[PDB]
Amino acid sequence: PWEECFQAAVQLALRAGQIIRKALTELVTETDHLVEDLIISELRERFPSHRFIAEKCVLTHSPTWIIDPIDGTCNFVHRFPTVAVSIGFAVRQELEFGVIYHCTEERLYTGRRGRGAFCNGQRLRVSGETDLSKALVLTEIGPKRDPATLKLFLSNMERLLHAKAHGVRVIGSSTLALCHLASGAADAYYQFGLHCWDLAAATVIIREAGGIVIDTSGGPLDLMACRVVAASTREMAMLIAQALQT
C-alpha cells in the first residue's frame, strides 16, 4: 500500500517508456504485450498477493494494480507524439497512487494519496477556473465506432459547445489529457466509454493537484461506469455534467 510499490511503478513506467520510445522509430500490438508483460511479471513476482486490472473493471478491497500498457494506441500507429503508459495502485477499494509517463516528451506524472501531484519534480495544481465560457475542455472518443457512440459524441460536443466552452481538444490519449487538467493546462475533461485503467492513475494525480473527478451524472466517480467528468473546480465539474446528457 506504499513506497516500494510506488518506487516500483516509477521504475517500471520509465523502463516501459523506453521500449515504447524506441518502438516509435519504424499492427505492432507486440509492443503492447512487451510492456504489459514486463510489468505484470515484475509486479506479480515482487507482490504475489496483489491483484491486477488491465486490458472487467471490478475493484475489490485487496491491493490491486490498474494498468494501461499503452494509452494512445492510434497515435502510436500514426506516430502522433502522444502515447503514454499508466500505472495505478489501489487498496481497501480506494486509489492510493498513480503514475503516468509521457513516452516521447519524457514527462513523469505521479500522484500519491495526501502527498500531492508532481510532473518531473514540479508540483501540479489545477487552474481554479469556475467560469465555463473561459474553459478549455478536453474529450476523446472510445475505441468504438458504432453510430450510437458517435451520435452521443457529437451531441455532447454540441451541448457543451453550446454552453460557450472556450475551446475543445481531442488528443488521442485520455490519460495524457487528464494530466493536462492536473497541471492547469486544461479546465475540464469528459468522456463516455473509457476503461478504468485509463482514469485510475490519473484520478489520484488530479485529486492531489486540487481538482475533482466525478461521474458524468454529477454523482461520485464509479469505476464500473466507463465514464467520467474531471475538472479544476466543483463549480466547473457540475456545470459540465449539467451541459452533458445520456
Q: Which residues bind a second copy (CB under 8 A)?
A: 74-75, 78-81, 105, 127, 136, 141, 145, 150, 153-154, 157-158, 161-162, 164, 166-172, 180, 183-187
Q: Which is nearer to a second copy, 68 or 96 (CB)?
A: 68
Longest distance between any two alpha carbons in the chain, whole Å: 51
What is the layout of strands, in order, in the sheet containing 212-214? 136-139, 188-192, 227-231, 212-214
Tell me how far, at minimum, the Cβ of 122 lies from a second copy, in Å: 11
Distance CA 129, CA 133 (A): 10
Exactly one of 129, 187, 198, 208 is catalytic; which is it?
198
* Owner of C-alpha cell 501531484: 117
Residues 6+ apart with CB under 8 A from 34: 19, 23
Known active-site residue 215: no
Which cell goes with 105?
A: 516528451
Known active-site residue 32: no
Residue 67: DSSP 8-state = E
CA atoms within 13 A on the CB side of 77: 8
Q: Which is nearer to a second copy, 126 or 223 (CB)?
A: 126
Q: Which is nearer to a second copy, 1 or 128 (CB)?
A: 128
Known active-site residue 105: no
Distance CA 84, CA 69 (A): 8
Distance CA 19, CA 70 (A): 11
Known active-site residue 146: no
Residue 71 marked ligand-binding: yes
Tell me how far, at minimum, the Cβ of 168 lies from a second copy, in Å: 6
Exactly one of 31, 64, 73, 110 is catalytic; which is it?
73
Exactly one of 20, 36, 64, 71 is catalytic; which is it?
71
Q: To the nearest 10°, report the CA torsion of 155, 158, 160, 166.
A: 150
Exactly one of 39, 53, 64, 68 is catalytic; which is it?
68
Tell me how far, at minimum, the Cβ of 174 lies from a second copy, in Å: 13
- Residues involved in catalysis: 55, 68, 70-71, 73, 198
Residue numbering of the annotated binding site: 55, 68, 70-73, 172-174, 191, 198
Task: Could you list the residues known to form a binding site for Mg(2+), using ranges.
Answer: 55, 68, 70-71, 198
Query: Per the annotation, where are the binding residues for substrate?
Result: 55, 70-73, 172-174, 191, 198
